[model samples]
Target: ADVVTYENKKGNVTFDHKAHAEKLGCDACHEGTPAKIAIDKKSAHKDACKTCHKSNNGPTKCGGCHIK
Candidate 1:
C-alpha cells in the first residue's frame, strides 16, 4: 500500500509503505530509544530515505530518477 504523500517546494513525494515495512521492519525506524513511540514526520522521512537520496548522492536532482 502507498503511504502518505509529502508536499514540499520541489514537488510531492509518495512514500512506499509496503516496501519500507518489508525492508526495515517497523521497530528499526520507529522510536529514538527503548520506548516504542512513533517518530515524527520530518525525522522519520529523513531517517528512512535521506541517506541514499541526499543533496549529492540522492535522487534530489531531476535526472536521478527521471532520465531524458
Candidate 2:
C-alpha cells in the first residue's frame, strides 16, 4: 500500500498504511472489511483519527499529521 493522502483546509494528512498495519493490525483501524475509509474534518479531528492518536501517543499537534 502507498501513503494515503487526505487533503483539508487545515493541511494535508499523509497516512502510512504499511507502517500502521505492522504496528496496529488491520482490525484496529479497519473494523470489518478492509477497504477505503471515509475521511473528513469531523472524523479526522473529533473522531477515530484524533482519538487513536491521543491514546497511542501519535502526533497530536495539528501540523504533526497535517503538513502545511
Report the number of the highest-lDDT candidate: 2
Which consecutive 10 residues in model 2 have the weakest lDDT in total?
39-48
Maximum-TM-score candidate: 2
Query: lDDT for every model?
Result: 0.53, 0.83
1-68, model 2: which lDDT tens digit per residue?
65788877788889888888889999998878898888778887866688888887798898889788
User: When superposed on Cα atoms, how far off is each prediction in RMSD?
Assistant: 6.0, 1.4
lDDT score, candidate 2, position 21: 89
Candidate 1 residue 39 C-alpha distance from true site, Å: 8.5
Off by over 4 Å in 1: 32-48, 52-68
Error of 2 at 8 (Å): 2.7
Residue 21, candidate 1: C-alpha displacement in angstroms: 0.5
**How many collisions per candidate?**
1, 0
